[PDB]
RNA sequence: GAAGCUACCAUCUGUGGGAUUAUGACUGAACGCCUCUAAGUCAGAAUCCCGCCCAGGCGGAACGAUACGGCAGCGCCGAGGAGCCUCGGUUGGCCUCGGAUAGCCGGUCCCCCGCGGGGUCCGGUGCGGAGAGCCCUUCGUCCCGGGAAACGGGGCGCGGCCGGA
RNA sequence: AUAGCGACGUCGCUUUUUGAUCCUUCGAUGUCGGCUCUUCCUAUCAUUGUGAAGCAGAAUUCACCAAGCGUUGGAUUGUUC
RNA sequence: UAAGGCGCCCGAUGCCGACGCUCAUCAGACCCCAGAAAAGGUGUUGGUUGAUAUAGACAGCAGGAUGGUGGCCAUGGAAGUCGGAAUCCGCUAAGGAGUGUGUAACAACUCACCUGCCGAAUCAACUAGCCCUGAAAAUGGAUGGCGCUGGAGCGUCGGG
RNA sequence: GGGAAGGCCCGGCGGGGAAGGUGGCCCGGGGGGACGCCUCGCCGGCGGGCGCGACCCCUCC
């Protein structure tokens, strides 16, 4: 089954292209592999883009199929996607993954130490967990 | 004409030389689909070499200049009176397309005729390009996507970037 | 620093390629359950080629002539070396670093399997078209252990279907662990998810 | 051309039910259960609405060639729910010039012997599919009826026992012998 | 005329399956009906492939015995002892479900069958139970303190029990 | 008209007939037949499985998959024929 | 850089290349060049022209499908159905001195045409792309090979 | 083309138009939420049901 369509004024996130990593709202379908767009609070200019390169979101906000960026921008912003976006944990996972391109070789040694103790803690008790169950199942 | 990247539209107009018997001649206007000023004055001349008993060396372009989209924002349907050349017999044709842009809609015109009917870009005489309403339109192609609540996913999504993880021990999705 | 790849799924040519390159890279590869990979294009098709192919023999003398392998594995291997310039020591020592096997022998049943996602069926075929299953080519060609392999797949997937009900249950210990010590290892968290490793 | 989308709706009736696990369909009513799947197609099956009122089938972006499969897996859907509430009874009958046919049905009508087919010394031994059942019609000089509830096995066991009395090497034109399928309907009527 | 060779000039023996071609069909759309075809399904042969049969690979397997009694040569072991010559490449490991893709993955008692398999429900889903990942992480030693551990670490240090074709 | 044929036309295929040419060979590639022996082709005579007849049966036509297996013994002639 | 190329052989697309077309039980794949035509396809994709359809079509399922008259010349027999011209009228919602099957002739069936149910698009005739039929030779065999079908094929194109 | 669009200020404001028709209205159904018909749950209570007839009584999507 289907769950994201793409229909007037859905939010999808572009992968790839010169507006990589923005969001987008889909306001027409030129055709059948293209669509007209524009991420009037997200500093996307109103363009055409073809469908390869967005990735659709679960985000709907309602305007007309040809309204003016002046509209769109005003049902982005009564919807309040940007704070939406930013709290779902697909955006979470792209921060993360920037935080982790972004890690310089100080903290990457820094992470190394506290992983270390991390991983020895936790075995060390999965072990006595495993221990106990054991001995429950005995 | 060698159709090459996107085509941009010219308005080209020309006149004869004066001479002894006429002081002015007419200017002639012409819209020309090509890559650029170079050979959509070449096309200027042969289509008005062909129309009118004129020629380069018996002419002039007085003006030549690209004519910029008008609403280059609002999704718009084209239609397009076209002239091509088979490899037996010539033929009268119409199609539609749907694009913002007229330069665009010509574009897709040469490309949609190279993969139909093997016809090239010299075989290829564009006609007549005019905004179309939707209510005028009569391609099934281009009328279905004229309606307010128009609703598709997108079922198969095949995997590109195959290579930037060459070796991957998933097995990838195709549904999203 | 062997690369183990798993048959099922890709495509026979496609497939071919990449490993030919690897192994000319220097590389030892080892691809394994050949019997799984598929050919684009339908049943028939392909094994009317694959009878003009048997078809082809030496008419003075066929003991000399071309060889026609019937497992699915030396097919695969056939194919792979006619990719690579086996005429020569470079290209021979090339092919020397590629094993090919049918099923999932014990050497490496007990490993993890690596993915080509540029040769797999789902990526480079759209789905309405027709494609063919090497191992039942070769079976109906003339492999004669089809039924076996089989079996022996069967007995190795419900042994590693215990091994990975093993596994989640482990992990689940450890998940209940993670959650229980919290308390005491949230200092040490905290620096992972500032560094996104956790998040 | 690709359509943009393609959908038909299927109401299926109170007494049976269906439940559908990706593609494959489960009918259950009372002559018992049919499944069939159909990874084949590759389109969107849905039950939608409450109390199980209709099966919905969507193509989305398909051409000519494979819009035809909507309907066709709708009709296949219909079959499986009239076979299930209704059954499928194929009646047939033995058309015979001089030498009558000698049908007769063992292993509780799941094979079925034919002898003296143009004074045949040979005898004619064919198996039905499973769950598929031969009988010889009561009321009647010669025929039989084969009871079942997928419309594809009883009518695959039709065509086999009709073929399987043809005449070989002479004109078929007037020798007009073996049995052929005279009607095909239900079970127990509506 | 022995023996031996030897003759349709004597006598004996000569095989079974599978996918399918042509063709005939089932269900069934496209195209309200129809249709062997488009998706799916069936029967199908001196053909094809294999079996039976002949050979047996710079292809493997199991098993037996493995060099005196004056010398001796051998096999296994002593984490057995120093070395000498020669051939090189390498410069951290990942010890594993099956598989789908017009769908998947993980928990669950709230139920049903034989700990496993189903049902409901709850979580994730551009895969944070991720290979775009995980694990180990090495300058060394000496004092005192805090955090984790007291069940842990190390032992051809041990004797057994299972685990594998 | 089209079971089976097919006029007046017109489009092809083959190199098992003959031509046309003269590229190789004249410090030589032994130049007709028959005998013997193997293999290959199909444009299928028979046999296996089929479809169509102006196919009642018998016989016989036309067509399809198909070269697996067979295709003889003699008079006359150096003959191929 | 030219010409030519960039899946592997084999240096180069390991571009998140663009738009389409095409399934081949003989696919196709680059000047010279190394193999094919006339004629066809309800395979599929475009295009041209003309029709009829809420005064309710196209299917499909059902009812009618009449008198003069078995029209005139005819043949042994021709009632419509082998033959020669014409083809009228009243009844009609409609019926042709007849579209076909059938008998020696009838008979009978059936069609043109009109009605009932169903309720929105449906018919043709051409034309051009790819694919398919046409398409048969001898040692086993050659898009250079492997192989390729979200193309590594065909057409138009872009960066590198 | 002294850039073509575009942005901001409801710019104001002049009139006009249909449609890929927003509300509104009419018809139809998929519904539900008040759950108004049974069944359990603790004669009064709330929660359990993953309850069960509704029907223009509305009422929302
Ligand atoms: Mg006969
Ligand atoms: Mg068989
Ligand atoms: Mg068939
Ligand atoms: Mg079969
Ligand atoms: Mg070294
Ligand atoms: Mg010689
Ligand atoms: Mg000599
Ligand atoms: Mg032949
Ligand atoms: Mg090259």
């Known amino acids: ?138 | 004409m060698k159709a090459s990247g996107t085509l941009r539209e010219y308005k080209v107009v020309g006149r004869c030389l004066p001479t002894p018997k006429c002081r002015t001649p007419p200017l002639y206007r012409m819209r020309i689909f090509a890559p650029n000023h170079v050979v959509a004055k070449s096309r200027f001349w042969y289509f008005v070499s062909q129309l009118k008993k004129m020629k380069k060396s018996s002419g002039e372009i007085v003006y030549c200049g690209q004519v910029f989209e008008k609403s280059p924002l609002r999704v718009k349907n084209f239609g397009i009176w076209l002239r091509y050349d088979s490899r037996s017999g010539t033929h009268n044709m119409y199609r539609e397309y749907r694009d913002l842009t007229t330069a665009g809609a010509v574009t897709q015109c040469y490309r949609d005729m190279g993969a139909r009917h093997r016809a090239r870009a010299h075989s290829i005489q564009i006609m007549k390009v005019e905004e179309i309403a939707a209510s005028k339109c009569r391609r099934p192609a281009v009328k279905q996507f004229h309606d307010s609540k128009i609703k598709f996913p997108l079922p198969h999504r095949v995997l590109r970037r195959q290579h930037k993880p060459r070796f991957t021990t998933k097995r990838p999705n195709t549904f999203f | 620093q062997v690369l183990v790849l798993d048959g099922r799924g890709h495509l026979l040519g496609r497939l071919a390629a990449i490993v030919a390159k690897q192994v000319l890279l220097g590389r030892k590869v080892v691809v394994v359950r050949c019997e799984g990979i598929n050919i684009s294009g339908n049943f028939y098709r392909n094994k009317l080629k694959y009878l003009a192919f048997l078809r082809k023999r030496m008419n003075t003398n066929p003991s000399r002539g071309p060889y026609h392998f019937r497992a699915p594995s030396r097919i695969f291997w056939r194919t792979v070396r006619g990719m690579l310039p086996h005429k020569t020591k470079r290209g021979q020592a090339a092919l020397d670093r590629l094993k090919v096997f049918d099923g999932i022998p014990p050497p490496y049943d007990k490993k993890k399997r690596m993915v080509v996602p540029a040769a797999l069926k789902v990526v480079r075929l759209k789905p309405t078209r027709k494609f063919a299953y090497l191992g039942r080519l070769a079976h109906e060609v003339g492999w004669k252990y089809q039924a076996v392999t089989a079996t022996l797949e069967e007995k190795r997937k419900e042994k590693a279907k215990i091994h990975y009900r093993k596994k989640k249950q482990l992990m689940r210990l450890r998940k209940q662990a993670e959650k229980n010590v919290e308390k005491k290892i949230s200092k040490f968290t905290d620096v992972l998810k500032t560094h996104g490793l956790l998040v | 051309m690709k359509t943009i989308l393609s959908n038909q709706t299927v109401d299926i009736p109170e007494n049976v039910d269906i439940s559908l696990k990706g593609r494959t369909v489960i009918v259950k009513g009372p002559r018992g259960t049919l499944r069939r799947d159909f990874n084949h197609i590759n389109v969107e099956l849905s039950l939608l609405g409450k109390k199980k009122k209709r099966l919905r089938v969507d193509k989305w972006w398909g051409n000519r060639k494979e819009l035809a499969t909507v309907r066709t897996i709708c009709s296949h859907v219909q079959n499986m729910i009239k076979g299930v509430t209704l059954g499928f009874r194929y009646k047939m009958r033995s058309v015979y010039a001089h030498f009558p046919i000698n049908v007769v049905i063992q292993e509780n009508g799941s094979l079925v012997e034919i002898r003296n087919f143009l004074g045949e010394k040979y005898i004619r031994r064919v198996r039905m599919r499973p769950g598929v059942a031969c009988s010889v019609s009561q009321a009647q000089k010669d025929e039989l009826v084969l009871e079942g509830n997928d419309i594809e096995l009883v009518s695959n066991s039709a065509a086999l026992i009709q073929q399987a009395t043809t005449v070989k090497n002479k004109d078929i034109r007037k020798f007009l012998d073996g049995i052929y399928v005279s009607e095909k309907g239900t079970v127990q009527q509506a």
């Open chain 1, 1 to 138: 089954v289907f769950r994201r369509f793409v229909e007037v004024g859905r939010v999808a996130y572009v992968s790839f292209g010169p507006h990589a990593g923005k969001l987008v709202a889909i306001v027409d379908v030129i055709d059948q592999n293209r669509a007209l767009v524009d991420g009037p609070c997200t500093r996307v200019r109103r363009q055409a883009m073809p469908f390869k390169c967005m990735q659709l979101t679960d985000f709907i906000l309602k305007f007309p199929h040809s309204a003016r960026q002046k509209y769109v921008r005003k049902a982005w912003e009564k919807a309040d996607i940007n704070t939406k976006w930013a709290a779902t944990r697909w955006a979470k996972k792209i921060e993360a993954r920037e935080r982790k391109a972004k890690m310089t070789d100080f903290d990457r040694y820094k992470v190394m130490k506290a992983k270390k103790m991390r991983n020895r803690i936790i075995k060390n008790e999965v072990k006595k967990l495993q221990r106990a169950a054991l001995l429950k199942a005995s």
